[PDB]
Amino acid sequence: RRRLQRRIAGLLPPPARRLNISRGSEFTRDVRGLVEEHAQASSLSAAAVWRAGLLAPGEVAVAWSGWRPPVFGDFLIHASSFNNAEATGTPLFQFKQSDPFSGVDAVFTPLSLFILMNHGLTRMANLLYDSPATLADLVPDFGRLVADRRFHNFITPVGPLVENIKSTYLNKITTVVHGPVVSKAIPRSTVKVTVPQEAFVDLDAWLSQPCPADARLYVALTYEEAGPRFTFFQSSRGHCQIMNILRIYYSPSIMHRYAVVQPLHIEELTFGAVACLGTFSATDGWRRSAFNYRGSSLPVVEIDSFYSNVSDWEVIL
Amino acid sequence: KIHPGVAMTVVRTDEILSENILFSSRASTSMFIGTPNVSRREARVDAVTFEVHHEMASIDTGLSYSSTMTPARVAAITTDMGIHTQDFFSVFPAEAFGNQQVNDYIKAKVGAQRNGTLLRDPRTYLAGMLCHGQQATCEI
Amino acid sequence: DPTFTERGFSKTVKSDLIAMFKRHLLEHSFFLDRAENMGSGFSQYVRSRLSEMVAAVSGESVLKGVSTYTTAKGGEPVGGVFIVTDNVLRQLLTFLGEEADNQIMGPSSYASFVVRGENLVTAVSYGRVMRTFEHFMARIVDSPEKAGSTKSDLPAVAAGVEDQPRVPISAAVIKLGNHAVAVESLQKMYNDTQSPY
Amino acid sequence: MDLKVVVSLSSRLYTDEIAKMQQRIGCILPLASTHGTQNVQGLGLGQVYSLETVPDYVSMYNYLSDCTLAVLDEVSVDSLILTKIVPGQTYAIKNKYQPFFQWHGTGSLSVMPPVFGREHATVKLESNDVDIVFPMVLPTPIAEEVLQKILLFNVYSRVVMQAPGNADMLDVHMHLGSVSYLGHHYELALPEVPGPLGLALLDNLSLYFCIMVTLLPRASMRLVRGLNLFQEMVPDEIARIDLDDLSVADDLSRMRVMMTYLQSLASLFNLGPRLATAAYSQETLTATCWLR
Amino acid sequence: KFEVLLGVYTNAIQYVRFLETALAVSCVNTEFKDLSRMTDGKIQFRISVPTIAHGDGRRPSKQRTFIVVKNCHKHHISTEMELSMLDLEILHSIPETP
Amino acid sequence: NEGVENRPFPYLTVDADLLSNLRQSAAEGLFHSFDLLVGKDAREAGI
Amino acid sequence: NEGVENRPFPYLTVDADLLSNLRQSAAEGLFHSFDLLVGKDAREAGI
Amino acid sequence: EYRSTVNPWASQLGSLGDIMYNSSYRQTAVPGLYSPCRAFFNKEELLRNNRGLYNMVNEYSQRLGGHPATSNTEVQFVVIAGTDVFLEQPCSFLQEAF
Lengths: 317, 140, 197, 292, 98, 47, 47, 98
Hints:
The structure is cut from a larger assembly and holds one copy of chain A, six copies of chain B and one copy of chain D.
Chain A: H1 3-11, H2 29-35, E1 41-43, H3 46-52, E2 71-78, E3 91-95, H4 110-118, H5 121-128, H6 142-147, E4 155-165, E5 170-180, E6 192-196, H7 204-207, E7 214-223, E8 228-235, H8 239-260, E9 273-281, E10 287-292, E11 297-304, E12 306-309, E13 314-315
Antiparallel strand pairs in A: 2-5, 3-4, 4-5, 5-12, 6-11, 7-8, 7-9, 9-12, 9-13, 10-11
Chain B: E1 16-24, E2 29-33, E3 37-43, E4 47-60, E5 67-77, E6 79-85, H1 88-91, H2 101-109, E7 134-138
Parallel strand pairs in B: 6-7
Antiparallel strand pairs in B: 1-5, 2-4, 3-4
Chain D: E1 4-8, H1 15-21, E2 28-30, E3 37-38, H2 57-66, E4 69-72, E5 79-84, E6 90-94, E7 108-112, E8 123-124, E9 131-132, E10 136-139, H3 140-162, H4 169-176, E11 178-181, E12 184-187, H5 204-225, H6 248-269, E13 274-277, E14 286-291
Parallel strand pairs in D: 1-3
Antiparallel strand pairs in D: 1-5, 2-4, 4-5, 6-14, 7-10, 7-13, 8-9, 11-12, 13-14
């Protein structure tokens, strides 16, 4: 009954949320304990681990805040299939391979996906990948898998890259599949998801009341007449709205697909699919930039502060 | 067993394991030892996947070569220097003749489709997907 | 061997060196395989091939002048190390004699390149740090009329590799005449980890 | 923040019960409550997938989407210490299911109620008279294909027990007897004799689906007469100009029951409690997943 | 009638330092603590080549000088060790019974 | 490549001669980053 | 336009406030070269 | 010098040896088998070694730029993983067989 007191005194304390500040010039111990957050990294010493508290269970606590650590999904890829000059924050799209026991993976950035679709944006695609044939056999039968319009249920978005070690023959990437996208380096710095500007469109800008707490990034494969395209939507609504909103936005191209060809078949009838990619702050995100290569540059959409959270593929019609 | 009009040559490769030497001069490179760092990466309910980080930076101190490597002795010959012509019905499987009868007969009379289980490097394959040493691949 | 590389490279000199590659590949490829053919000039044969190895290497490092590693028993600089397997280490110990030393003097701890104040100022402002700012300021501010010599610049190249206590590490020390190279095998370090050497 | 749901047994187990349980030390099961101790009658799918009543996919799926789920961790002789899945954290599950569908990394897992027979997913406890039924956990594309292929097998078995002049029993079996995903070509255990008058699994879902697509064409006719020309070129016109006169009470009743049978079915083909994996390592048959 | 156990034996791991092995004569090391912040290194050599005054009339190579620079290259090693949460909870707790 | 700095540095007088097979090595490109100053390229450049 | 180095300098506090019509100036481009840091990104960058 | 070729069915640019062997290998190619003729017939591989003597001597030791074969398998494959293989093939260097 007193052992329970000493135990419940340790299991009691929630983090002190409010605090009576007196003067901002004071910077006393209470406000430092409010602003201090423990790191996921320290040097391998006894004092550094025992002060950073790396061995704490569940979270990192020196010796439940709305903060959870992320989860990494590491893939091993053919090093020719992934141009290593790409930045940290680019959304990768792992193709579910038809090989039964293959331990090698086939990820795609959307730039590498563009030369897969078609076979400035095209200039940076062909400068980043001089070879449209070593990716045309990663998918073994692209013409069949698109001509029966089942390409959307084979591509699993795995969120953005965070760290990529450049090995020579078989490349190892570390992505973030779910949660808060943040770097793991010895100086920690911010990671920003970069999507190409010509591919990225907006949805509040296309429509031109309330402000939400977060906006959700959407990816959208769609089967047109001239091949598939990977547009990237950003929306601040909910999903069940966005299905009807993109049905309105594609209601031109739905009539165009029924018009320029008549679907005598039955597997052609789907018109793309959309999958949520996660939430970011709806206020100051997607500040544009340009991704500078050795000789050229494409304009890029640099979404800061991503919470990666993949959803599944829902058809559009 | 009569000769055709042509006369092929046969190319192989023969893996020879050695036990190499390595020399390098005194103070060939100058390196910087970074401080090791510990970082947890996946923290599920039952176990927490740790990861240690370490980084070094290596730079030269001379211009020309300062390290060398020679194969001292043969340990053994890891391949059999034999006769294993690699199957062109497997490296170009999309090629097919006129009829299906004649194609099937030709695939019957030769060693066609003999190992269709592995068609890649099996190190890339996972754990658990002609019982002699390593066949040197002949080519015509 | 500079005896062919003096008149400049051409088609002819490059062809000559390709043919001499082919000759050295067909004659002196495995220097321990055809070592065991002859037995009389045999310690001298391995001795000659290893002296050829330390003669075909280029020891012109800029850290040549500073004494980092010496033999414990005599003040002789090491001048290179040999990395071999276990069986070749045992064979070379028998063939080059058991007269190897057991230890060499070396640095106890590493040197320290901590970014001091002025280099921190340059790193903060531009992000370009110069090694040993004290020597740059001592050259082109304090009397730049002083011309540089090797004897003047021996503390400039040797930053902190000279102010370390010498403690002996254990290594077999064979002599190819005037050098004292050091053979060693790390297969011991790689065998317990079930890892390919 | 602790998660140990230690369910206590009244009468302690034998050895062979522990021998069956230690081969299912990584599967998940639905609880009844999220409380610190429980009894055995709240565990996985006993009360709804019992052997004494006719079972249906609908109420099993509703109960499975209803309550919390829980991977099990330890099996003592008289207690089963386990942990429940909250959406905040991520867990380590194992594919120890008797129809062994090979998982993959970064795949999405569907917690399905068992279709492949009760005896494949059970731990028949005798010391206590309970049947711990474990729910089927298998990847979502395989879940979709196995639902389509159990459903069409149900409809096609029902029409050939309706009349043998409809179809051939090998023809339905040489297509729907196998599920294919990434080359892993499985074979499905099919109950070739389900028995008439229902009394079997997947009748209530099949009855719902067949009533839905029966009421579908006049529903489409009513909802195109309510409102254009593109919508009147994709279907054939014999499904367009069919009736145009039904009694309004029966029309409204048919449309309402079609709407309920559509919304339940469409909520059902979304597989409910869906889990999303990160790094499935089949050297130890471990998948790392979270509640999605 | 007993079954006897005679011994549990566990190996002692050897620790191998870089300053202890004989590969450290091959390279000179300096403890640069904040290395991952440094983007790139650069060494620079100015090599002046003295030449020989000859007799005959040749096209004379004048005072030559070689400026060669060499870069450093990073090397990033990382392995994974695992620790069960049970051991960590036992670690950050306090015991009272033997 | 000739992306070399080429500024008048305080250069360190080191003992070891590196001139052995030097011009022949720079002729066939042992280095990616090197500069050949001949005659009146060999002035220390301006600030 | 994003031309600034954005490094943590030792900045100097002046006597004269410069705050008038500032966001209005940066909205229309009185300054050719500038960088706006809002909230989170207003930290000093890393060395 | 008294002839051009020892054979005209593999030395010419459109000859049969350059038909069945000059196909450039991709690291994703689903046949993936090892070839010994592609170290001798691959055209851009046959012009890779024109970059100077010291450049290709550096490339002999830096990377396995030729056509390397895998080891310890039943039939030799094109090595893809290569995480712990060590091989120096001088048939990619000087293009001459014994």
